[PDB]
Write a protein that binds this ligand. Structure first.
Ligand SMILES: Cc1cc(C(=O)N2CCC3(CC2)CCN(C(=O)OCC(C)(C)C)[C@H]3C)cc2cn[nH]c12
Ligand SMILES: Cc1cc(C(=O)N2CCC3(CC2)CCN(C(=O)OCC(C)(C)C)[C@H]3C)cc2cn[nH]c12
Lengths: 728, 721
């Protein structure tokens, strides 16, 4: 016992595995449910400080496989795990789900064979993934491992003989490895003849069983571990398209461990915990130099957070768990459940305070979440304190995050107007290589920011199942040599793909001082996904194929300019010396042609051409979007229910059921009627599924009387109900 | 008659649109010559009909005077008799007319392109796009140019500025007279006793000026993204392709770029204006083949339009006539029944292409795994560490992925925009996946799967993914993950084969394991292949350390064992003990190199195809010389069984349940493991098999049972009782 004389029992002595995990710089697996309890308790404190919590607000039940290999909930002592992979089913009452929400936590046990993935860990991880997938519930993975388990046939280590070239001089080499009749008998005695494949030969009157292949009796030595790695990689790839998936890198995550972090997409990396393939030491041996001093140079946060593999960083395990729980607060309790409304003190009915201006620099985040000013807080478009930024360490030209709009959660994409700079590190492996600083102009999509945008669209869509708002403000894609060579076209195309796949309402809004040009409009137009997309443009927004400077250079040339000077200038007209007057007028007429061009680029032309749904005023956008989104979600939910027929037919069907006094165009009135008539519309449609099922059998019976009656006859507690109905 | 437009196109460096069907006729005629020189062709072998919208706006085939196109986008429906489809195959060719408003995309061109895309998609037929354009159509309200007035700050001094632009009552009356009041949005004000109609927005009476072109661009970008998942899509860049035109090339994925024809976003001139310097001299510095073929946007290059059309027609020869039709078998003189001649050796460097398609040698041709002359390499200008292409195996077409074992080097160009930037040469070791080669592998898997609908073989030979700083920073994990995604989505048979001298390690095995897609994937390893988590040096470092090395020396070395034995005496003088220990340690030092080698062999003996077979991770261990004969019948049998699974899917279930049912129909004497026997039986019985194939609720029951007759109720009561 160390230390002695502590006020309470030494938890690191009661379970020595807890100390082993601490020695490795991570939390003991069986202590992670407690960290979830703390983070969930903190959630309530930040939401409503006055709320009193009972210990039944949070429930953690370990999941283990029974005799049949089926997952079952158990209460047992920490550290009784016969495999290096553990799981817990968590049931929490949260501010967004006061009656409770569930999720699954899968985790490597770093104390069990250094958290290596053997066939049993892989098959358990897969079973847990499938369990969460069948239930539609989130899958949290706590990665603390050393990749696929490595082993050798230990029973062959004390038996194998060496066939020397010269037994007197071992440095002269060997020809093969073999077993003696004794070695073969040893294996037969222990039922391990199958551990090796041998070819019998006779050298100097003695039997030599030359070893042709070593198999081993123990499972988990090599390729079988690789098979299991492939299984769970495929399982995670699938899971991401199905349920909310997230990973916390709590200690190292190696090989398959690194691939799982990426395949689950959403990742939170604890500072100092690397995500690696081959380690630095091994890479030094292969390279034949001491190139790297740490694994952090390969997969630390300075690598994975900067390249977007890690969406967020955490100072420690609890901070990471807090970030998981916060990220989940925007996500439905389970697949296909409505987005979780969390109304705070910042309600919908207010103007937007912070407004950008054409001549002044701003941070988009002020437009999104508001800005703290000396005169007080200037509220933004979304709920105060609701912006949860992600992928914040990578491709800073685009700003992605979750936010709330009057309590409605959604994904948000905004454009960083300020110039962004990133440091490409100097690789110690190449001495010729030096560190490089790249500068990227604002309101231009580059390969990395185009990739980030597509990634964000995909991560809001899959698992999160969130609606989205893109505050579209791009001049286009970088058409320069470097960026074209660096495949900007491929990354831009991913955006279209991501939009085509989107299954929740999308709002494209060109904001005040914002613009969309030829190259950028193409990848965000609502005709890409007309079932879900809508575009709006602010009254102070701009859009055209080219910028005014370009549209004047091509369509308002010298001939037009001079014909204008003749129409509008007394001196020029009197004269038509003319070249001298032309020189005098060139600056101001240049401004006039630019204005003439700019007057085509307005939200009013956009409305007239039928390319946007409405032109909007920024200060009123919060009030407008709140009711538009509330309405759009309410209709979507009805469409999904009505799927139990084209969407175009379903929307025409739904919008017809509205009382005649309801103005279809009135979002608030439509959204209000749907929510008030929900229980009634739940009844009205179930009572028509039954009316159809009644007419279904009334067809089958009237066509095939005695044959259907015999079918009814063929098809305990259900029989009792059916008896009661006959009895009346 | 067409000579002016034909010359205009030639001046641009492209073929006149209405002359492209002829280029397809030539390329199709050449296909037959290369296949069978003695075959005589009639004019009915090739049919081109123009597609136009009817009264109902529906696409219809027509014969009309070429050059009669009222829009800058034209389409043709082609019906060709090819070596792989002698009775004929169909496809659609969409093309910009470079002579019609410089091939710009206006609302009408976009809506036509979309209608043609949808037409091909509904029919399952390939969509060929011939890109020759200048992107979205640019315009201004020309009727407002001679009407607008300037509201000066001081009419006597124009340089003092202006406040707005306006129309007079005259201007407003002119527009009213021509039915164009809607061309502008105005605000009425009175200045100096005269009406000023302040211009708030210019709309214009002419359609196709700006945002309505941009909407149409978005429509066709979405349409092409969808088309790629649905039908075979390919693009030939025949003149410049700009903006939406550049995006269309990428969104259709498969692209053949004619040399000197650039794929660009903003042109060099405009970029020079924005940058405020003469940075670039040509569009080719931005989107020429030296850019797009080197980065994989362009899969292939062509010296001219006919060469490009020839490459389209060749690529199509591996592709089904239409979606979900079986892969087109094209048996040539190189039949299945032969060994594989070219064999790699561990000590001699080789080009994988020799293993794939064979090698011409002084002693004669050394045949490879696939049919002689069938290897059609693609993405050959980018990420050269991986080799991708279409090939034929006894006439069966398939996608092939192989590993370039030789070190690859690529030149990153110096951007004229950054003077501080210099050209860089990157060197990548063979048998290692880097970001670009991982991306190329995933791209290839996706392109064989979507539209092409081909089976695939991966000649797996990777030590892993590059785990170094540069490649990790350059997101190798993201590109490696795309491989898993691409495999999960695959819908045709996959064969993973670790070839002779080949290997698969911890990082590389994870992304190709058949448990990723058990319905379609299978793994095999050559008898001279290797696989383990780590390479032998790695394994001994973790699992055959000092203590194990010393224990072996104690077992196998006389001197070491004798000395260790001497340390058991309890009467030894401490200085004698120290000398025995020193001698023991000296002996250990002498033996460490050779015992290290022993441990390496001990490790290597675990890494064999026989352990792989014993562990059940591969289906069979194979001999390279017999692989062609083996894979031909394996693939033929799988294509046959796949066909039966689909047919059964329609009549009725899991894949496990579906093959089990189908295989239960095979005669009992048929060995399910005998590929040739199963394929032979199936093909002899397609028609017989076709005959076999052709041959809350409780509340609902409660509602209907209630309406039954007394006699019916009695029977239903008895059953419950
Ligand atoms: C004909 C014509 C068009 C335009 C125009 O509409 N844009 C200019 C180009 C951009 C889109 C808007 C803005 C930067 N950009 C780009 O490719 O930048 C690459 C790096 C970043 C390398 C400079 C395009 C996305 C302006 C002018 C000025 N003179 N003549 C013009
Ligand atoms: C512990 C241990 C493991 C391994 C091992 O199994 N591999 C070595 C690493 C590689 C995979 C096989 C080969 C190159 N490689 C890589 O990341 O290379 C990056 C650049 C290209 C930058 C050198 C891995 C894909 C060998 C040794 C030798 N001593 N100790 C070892």
């Amino acid at each position: 016992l160390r230390p002695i004389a502590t006020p309470y029992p030494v938890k690191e002595w009661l379970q020595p595995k807890r100390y082993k995990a601490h020695l490795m710089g991570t939390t003991y697996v069986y202590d992670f449910p407690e960290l979830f309890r703390q983070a969930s308790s903190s959630q309530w404190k930040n939401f409503s400080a006055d709320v009193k919590l009972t210990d039944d607000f949070f429930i953690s039940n370990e999941l283990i496989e029974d005799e049949n290999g089926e997952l079952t909930e158990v209460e047992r002592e920490p550290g009784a795990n016969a495999i290096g992979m553990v799981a817990f089913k968590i049931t929490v009452k949260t501010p967004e789900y006061p009656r409770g929400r569930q999720f699954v936590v899968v985790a490597n046990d770093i104390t069990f064979k250094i958290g290596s993935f053997g066939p049993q860990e892989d098959e358990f991880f897969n079973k847990v993934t499938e369990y969460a997938r069948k239930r539609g519930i989130p899958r949290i993975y706590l990665a603390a491992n050393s990749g696929a388990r490595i082993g050798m046939a230990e029973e062959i280590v004390p038996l194998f003989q060496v066939a020397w070239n010269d037994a007197a001089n071992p440095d002269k080499g060997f020809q093969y490895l073999y077993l003696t009749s004794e070695g073969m008998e040893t294996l037969k005695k222990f039922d391990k003849e199958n551990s090796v494949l041998t070819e019998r030969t006779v050298i100097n009157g003695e039997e030599r069983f030359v070893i042709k292949t070593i198999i081993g009796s123990e499972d988990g030595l090599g390729v079988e571990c690789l098979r299991g790695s492939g299984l769970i990689a495929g399982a995670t790839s699938r899971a991401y398209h199905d349920i909310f998936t997230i990973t916390l890198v709590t200690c190292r995550s190696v090989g398959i461990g690194a691939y799982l972090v990426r395949l689950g997409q959403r990742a939170i990396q604890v500072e100092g915990q690397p995500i690696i393939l081959t380690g630095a030491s091994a890479l030094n041996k292969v390279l034949g130099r001491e190139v790297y001093t740490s694994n952090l140079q390969l997969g630390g946060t300075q690598i994975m957070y900067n390249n977007g593999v890690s969406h967020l960083t955490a100072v420690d395990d609890l901070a990471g768990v807090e970030k998981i729980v916060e990220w989940m607060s925007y996500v439905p309790a389970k697949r296909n459940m409505p987005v979780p409304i969390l109304e705070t003190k910042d309600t919908w009915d207010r103007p937007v305070d912070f407004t950008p201006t054409n001549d002044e620099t701003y941070d988009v985040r002020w437009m999104i979440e508001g800005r703290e000013t000396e005169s007080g807080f200037e509220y933004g478009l979304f709920d105060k304190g609701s912006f949860f930024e992600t992928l914040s360490g990578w491709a800073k030209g685009v700003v992605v995050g979750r936010a709330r709009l009057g309590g409605i959660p959604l994904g948000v994409i905004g454009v960083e107007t300020r110039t962004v700079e990133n440091l490409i590190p100097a690789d110690p492996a190449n001495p010729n290589s030096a560190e490089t600083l790249i500068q990227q102009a604002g309101q231009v999509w580059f390969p990395n920011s185009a990739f980030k945008t597509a990634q964000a669209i995909n991560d809001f869509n899959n698992g999160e199942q969130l609606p989205m708002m893109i505050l579209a403000n791009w001049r286009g894609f970088s058409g320069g040599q470097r960026d074209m060579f660096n495949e900007v076209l491929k990354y831009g195309s991913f955006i279209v793909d991501a939009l085509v796949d989107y299954k929740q309402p999308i709002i494209i809004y060109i904001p005040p001082t914002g613009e969309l040009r030829g190259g950028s409009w193409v990848v965000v137009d609502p005709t890409i996904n007309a079932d879900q997309m809508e575009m709006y443009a602010d009254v102070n927004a701009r859009a055209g194929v080219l910028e005014p400077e370009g549209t004047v250079e091509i369509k308002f040339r010298r001939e037009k300019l001079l014909d204008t000077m003749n129409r509008l200038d007394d001196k020029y007209r009197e004269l038509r010396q003319l070249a001298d007057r032309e020189r005098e007028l060139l600056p101001i007429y240049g401004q006039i042609s630019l204005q003439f061009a700019d007057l085509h680029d307005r939200s009013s032309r956009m409305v007239a051409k039928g390319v946007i749904s409405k032109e909007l005023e920024w200060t009123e956008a919060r009030r407008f979007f709140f009711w538009r989104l509330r309405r759009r979600l309410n209709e979507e939910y009805l469409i999904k229910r009505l799927s139990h027929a084209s969407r175009l037919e379903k929307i025409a069907r739904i919008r017809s059921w509205y009382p005649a006094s309801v103005d279809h165009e009135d979002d608030r009135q439509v959204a209000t009627w749907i929510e008030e008539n929900y229980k009634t519309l739940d009844d009205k449609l179930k009572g028509l599924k039954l009316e159809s099922f009644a007419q279904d059998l009334a067809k089958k019976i009237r066509s095939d009387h005695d044959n259907a009656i015999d079918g009814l006859s063929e098809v305990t507690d259900d029989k009792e109900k059916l008896l009661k109905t006959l009895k009346l």
